[PDB]
């Protein structure tokens, strides 16, 4: 069990690592203050993979405390209402349920996601989160939520040589249910720029 729970999650981080390095495919959506988001076709499902990049003005373990899988995310992230750690497998590997609220003028009704999420730490100091969908018998479709499926996604928290942190995040989400494309195509870009906007505010609160 261990050897494969660990295994398919290791595959996830491997893909995430490749998403971080790749410079190809990526077509820019928008930019502006602090952030930059681009996208490309996912190979995991019909839809897209989204890439956020942005310097967060906080210590590396403050920014991580915010996005770490419960901790903090329920608070500051407008797109999260419920975070539950279901089956805590390893020190560093666990199965989580995430509840999103309504979005895009109630066109996107609440979804929930059941992820295998692995925290893995790199040699440079980078701490990362690596999440993929998994079916779990103790967390089936809930009444009034659509079951969404995240494909390999999460956060890279990268220390900078000074007192700041680089945050690169990938949203790889299948909203699923029954949604027109253009709805979905508008939401995600905006969802990422708002994510960073929020994350920043949360950080600032420790420096105040």
Number of domains in the chain: 1
**CB contact at 8 A, 193 and 30:** yes
Query: 3-state DSSP: the chain helix, strand, coil percent, rounded to 5?
Result: 25, 35, 35
CA atoms within 13 Å, Cβ hemisphere of 19: 32
- Alpha-helix runs per DSSP H in 28-180: 60-67, 73-76
How far, in Å, CA of 34 to CA of 28, rounded?
15
What Å distances lie between residue 202 and 24, 51, 65, 197, CA to CA?
32, 21, 10, 9
Query: Do residues 54 and 34 lie in contact, with contact meaning Cβ atoms separated by under 8 Å?
Result: yes
By the 10 Å C-beta count (0-12 exposed, 13-18 middle, 19+ buried), 128 is classed as: buried
Task: List the resolution, Å.
Answer: 2.5
CATH number at residue 188: 3.30.530.20
Q: In terms of residue numbers, what domain contains 198? A: 1-208
Report whether 177 contacts 146 (CB < 8 A). yes
Method used to solve the structure: X-ray
């Amino acid at each position: 069990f261990q050897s494969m729970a660990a295994q398919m999650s290791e595959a996830v981080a491997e893909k995430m690592l490749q998403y971080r390095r790749d410079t190809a495919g990526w077509k820019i959506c928008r930019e502006g203050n602090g952030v930059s988001v681009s996208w490309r076709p996912s190979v995991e499902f019909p839809g897209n993979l989204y890439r956020g990049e942005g310097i967060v003005y906080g210590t590396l373990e403050e920014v991580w405390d915010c996005v770490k899988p419960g901790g903090l995310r329920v608070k500051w992230d407008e797109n999260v209402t419920g975070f539950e750690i279901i089956q805590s497998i390893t020190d560093t590997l666990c199965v989580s349920r995430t509840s999103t609220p309504s979005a895009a003028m109630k066109l996107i009704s609440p979804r929930d996601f059941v992820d295998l999420v692995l925290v893995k730490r790199y040699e440079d100091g980078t701490i990362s989160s690596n999440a993929t969908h998994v079916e779990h018998p103790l967390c089936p479709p809930k009444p009034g939520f659509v079951r969404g499926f995240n494909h390999p996604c999460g956060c890279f928290c990268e220390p900078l040589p000074p007192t700041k942190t680089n945050l690169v995040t990938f949203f790889h989400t299948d909203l699923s249910g029954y949604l027109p494309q253009n709805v979905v195509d508008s939401f995600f870009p905006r969802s990422m720029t708002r994510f960073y906007a929020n994350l920043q505010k949360a950080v600032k609160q420790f420096h105040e």
